[PDB]
Amino acid sequence: GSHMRGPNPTAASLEASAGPFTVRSFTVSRPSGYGAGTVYYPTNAGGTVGAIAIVPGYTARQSSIKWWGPRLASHGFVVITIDTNSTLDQPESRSSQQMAALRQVASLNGTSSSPIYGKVDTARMGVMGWSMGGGGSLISAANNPSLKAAAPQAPWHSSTNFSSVTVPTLIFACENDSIAPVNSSALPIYDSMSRNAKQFLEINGGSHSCANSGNSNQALIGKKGVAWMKRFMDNDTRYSTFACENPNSTRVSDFRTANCSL
């Protein structure tokens, strides 16, 4: 049950702004259980690809997280980026809306008129998001253990105990985060998970927006995000090296992993 699409990656090629596959996008016409959606898909991937739903933080919109659209989609995924019903939605609401976006992607996969008909393996899904949307991503993983992977960024939740989570979980953390401090949010969430493949990448002198569109580490962050999603959503062991690697870089202030078999 492996699903290998594309060429054998290299560090240099995963650090590039774009993967091998051409990306098109469209706006969701009638959003079902969320505010608005942009869908990114690869035009000719060679086989069905998994879907990733990405949710912003409090007051934020699609622009905060938009870069992940092409970065992942060009490596063979369907990515939906959402605006929430209200810019002031809390983490549990952000999780329900994340799962509704995945449901409507499974829907547009069965929709002869949609540009993604037949394009999706609906049994291969992942979740990502920023701050309260990263908290929602961890709530989606805890409630839906069939999800293949989770890669939240600068995660925010009112509770740090995610000990139930069995989904392979990569947490991007920002060293200088004053909004969701690492010592009280990202690290405690990471320390709670003992039943899963997990990783903690912390960006040297990073602010709260250190993994957002236009950050100064899209090379490293993008490489790690694609690696983690290819390893765990496709069971593609070509990406085991990149997924589990402790990057030798000054751009990283901390790195931890567990159950990440090479």
DSSP SS3 for 75: coil
157 in active site: no
DSSP string computed for 156-219: --S----TT--S-EEEEEETT-SSS-TTTTHHHHHHH--SS-EEEEEETT--TTTTSTT-TTHH
Of 239, 209, 210, whose CA–CA distance to 59 is shortest? 209
Of 172, 138, 132, whose CA–CA distance to 156 is shortest? 132
Q: Is 229 annotated as a binding residue?
A: no
Structure tokens at 172: 């991007």
Q: Which residue among 185, 208, 234, 236 is the active-site one?
A: 208
Domain extents for the chain? 1-262
Q: Which residue among 83, 177, 234, 236 is the active-site one?
A: 177
**149 close to 228: Cβ distance less than 8 angstroms:** yes
Structure tokens at 222: 């993008």
CATH for 1-262, among 3.40.1160.10, 3.40.50.740, 3.40.50.1820, 1.10.579.10? 3.40.50.1820
First to last CA, the chain: 18
Of 188, 179, 207, whose CA–CA distance to 59 is shortest? 179
**32 close to 100: Cβ distance less than 8 angstroms:** yes
Q: Is 58 annotated as a binding residue?
A: yes
Structure tokens at 74: 């060009």
In the chain, count of helices (H) and strands (E)? 7, 9
The DSSP element (H or E) to which 139 belongs, if any, is helix 132-143
Structural resolution in Å: 1.9
In sequence order, the β-bridge partners of residue 23 are 42
Q: Which residue has the tokens 């809390």?
A: 90
177 in active site: yes
Method: X-ray
The DSSP element (H or E) to which 13 belongs, if any, is helix 11-14
Q: Which residue among 131, 137, 140, 185 is the active-site one?
A: 131
DSSP SS3 for 24: strand
Q: Could you give the CA distance from residue 40 to residue 34 in angstroms, rounded to a whole number?
A: 17
Burial of 231 (0-12, 13-18, 19+ CB in 10 A): buried
Q: Could you give the CA distance from residue 216 to residue 95 in angstroms, rounded to a whole number?
A: 28
Q: Is 132 annotated as a binding residue?
A: yes
